[PDB]
Design a protein around this ligand. Structure first.
Ligand SMILES: *[C@H](O)[C@H](C[C@@H]1CCNC1=O)NC(=O)[C@H](CC(C)(C)C)NC(=O)[C@@H](NC(=O)OCc1ccccc1)C(C)(C)C
Ligand SMILES: *[C@H](O)[C@H](C[C@@H]1CCNC1=O)NC(=O)[C@H](CC(C)(C)C)NC(=O)[C@@H](NC(=O)OCc1ccccc1)C(C)(C)C
Lengths: 306, 306
């Protein structure tokens, strides 16, 4: 029993963190096989950040302008190319600690773990979600760029995120590992807004099932609702529409608890409409939307990784 | 910017997780050098758990009753001894992945990271605190025993916890790595209560400074308070007494923000007395006591590990 914001073990990713240095920019990079991936604003200076043409900026660079520490040892860059907003530095040594891995581009609502890094050195690990507005609510300081987001899938490190920048509300924007920004953002230091974010309804519901699975039941009710009626009450409270395809993923949880999905919606309904009136769910005084239905099954069932 | 419940990178500890099997009990163990440490209720059966005399139970065992997987490879046990509630199995192979490490016995209020494990295989990592009642609020299923709690200190894995058991309210009880229970608990399956828990005042305050450091200020006030007066308002709200020695640790944060500690107490005061009235701090609708003053400096300053 218990239910915590839980993050994938970070061992496999740590063994891939390297320092990448160009000019007076030092950020983190991901070394997998003989390629090191970092954000391409490692070739920028400060006056370069307001409006750069990275195509230009990078033809002016040579392999020797890329200092790569892996630990105390220096990696020899032998080639570079730019794929969207990531730099792919071909180095002479392949990484012995390279895990089975993939690059995946995740959908908003899905969670991943973040290994926060400075000068190639992990600082911490935490769990995040990809907000409906393609921001992520992270903990990132200067130098944290090139820290990655990832899931694990038994043995396979599935990379979905690289950190690029912080927006003025303190949320964060980055790219998948093939370099493409999640969301309308660019790696320019020009003003950009997050876009009003919404709550991940299907995840709130799964966390309600995490609650039931753990002994918190005070928020349940005899009432049922139609998905059609429920979405009419979720827009009102800035939740995201729940699809039948959500009902299906929420199914195994539904079946494990004996609480049909559409009643867990009728429960959620009343919760938005009344609040919690002192009470907490799973030690949270808030409806919590950063747990996917797979997260809840993971944590409440005991899936491991190797 | 940002502020998340952040856990130490788990790489170094993962490389120490092994499966330990005796009879039909399988739990996790910590392999460091040529010793594997696990809970001593791996020699128990089910009818053994109600009232065992582990001294007896363990003289009846032989080294060959201890099956230890490290990965796919089997460890040869050559000696065992019982220190309090931990078993120290001397194996023939020393662990190549053994990090610089220590065993430390932490005080209530201090935090540590938990690497949750099943059959030697990490499941997740999360951050915890040692509650004032020597329980910890964890996420632990069957087989999770022998999962450890730890801090890192640049390069040194400082081990402070091994998981042993769950109490009927879904909180967790374990031991330091020299085998001694945190709290009045025993590794018997006899009824035991957690003892009413209190809030870690000094940590709530540090998290308030995390809030200030991150742009949340709505809860501040012109008012000041005396520590003596403040403790008179914290007992009322079941917080723990704040000592001058807390004021000193909260000092660097105090100085970094320009908010004298005793005003952050006057802020806390009003918060307990009024609640938050819709608002949140750092995305939490609750005062959050599982961040130490060192955690906040760690996360808000960018200390790393190697
Ligand atoms: C890379 O290590 C660093 C990580 C930052 C530092 C603190 N937290 C982070 O997320 N990223 C950067 O320094 C970014 C560099 C570029 C990607 C090249 C822009 N810069 C920022 O993240 C930057 N954000 C930003 O400029 O865009 C929003 C904006 C808002 C108002 C006006 C202009 C722009 C700041 C960190 C905010 C400077
Ligand atoms: C070891 O892997 C396992 C981890 C448990 C399983 C689910 N969550 C956990 O924390 N630990 C145990 O199975 C414990 C075995 C002993 C340490 C030998 C007792 N058992 C428990 O944790 C046990 N707790 C308990 O018996 O004490 C409280 C109690 C309350 C009422 C009446 C009697 C005792 C249970 C998990 C609750 C069975």
């Amino acid at each position: 029993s218990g239910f915590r914001k839980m993050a994938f073990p970070s061992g496999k990713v740590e063994g891939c963190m390297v320092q990448v240095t160009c000019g007076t920019t030092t950020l983190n990079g991901l070394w997998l096989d003989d390629v090191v991936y970092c954000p391409r604003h490692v070739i920028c200076t400060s006056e370069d950040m307001l409006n750069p043409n990275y195509e230009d900026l990078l033809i002016r660079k040579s392999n020797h302008n890329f200092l790569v520490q892996a630990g105390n040892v220096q990696l020899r860059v032998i080639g570079h190319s730019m794929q969207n907003c990531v730099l792919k530095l071909k180095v002479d040594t392949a990484n012995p600690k390279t895990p089975k891995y993939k690059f995946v581009r995740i959908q908003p609502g899905q969670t991943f773990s973040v290994l926060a890094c400075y000068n190639g050195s992990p600082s911490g690990v935490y769990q995040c979600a990809m907000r409906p507005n393609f921001t992520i609510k992270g903990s990132f300081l200067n130098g944290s760029c090139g820290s990655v987001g990832f899931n694990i899938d038994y043995d396979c490190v599935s990379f979905c995120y690289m950190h690029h920048m912080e927006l003025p509300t303190g949320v964060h924007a980055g790219t998948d590992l093939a370099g493409n920004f999640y969301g309308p953002f660019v790696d320019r230091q020009t003003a950009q807004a997050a876009g009003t974010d919404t709550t991940i309804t299907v995840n709130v519901l799964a966390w309600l099932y995490a609650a039931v699975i753990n002994g918190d039941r005070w928020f349940l009710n005899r009432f049922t609702t139609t998905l059609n009626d429920f979405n009419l009450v979720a827009m009102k409270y800035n939740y995201e529409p729940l699809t039948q395809d959500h009902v299906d993923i929420l199914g195994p949880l539904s079946a494990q608890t004996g609480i049909a999905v559409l009643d867990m919606c009728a429960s959620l309904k009343e919760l938005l409409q009344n609040g919690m009136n002192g009470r907490t769910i799973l030690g949270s005084a808030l409806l919590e939307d950063e747990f996917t239905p797979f997260d809840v099954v993971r944590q409440c069932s005991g899936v491991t990784f190797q």
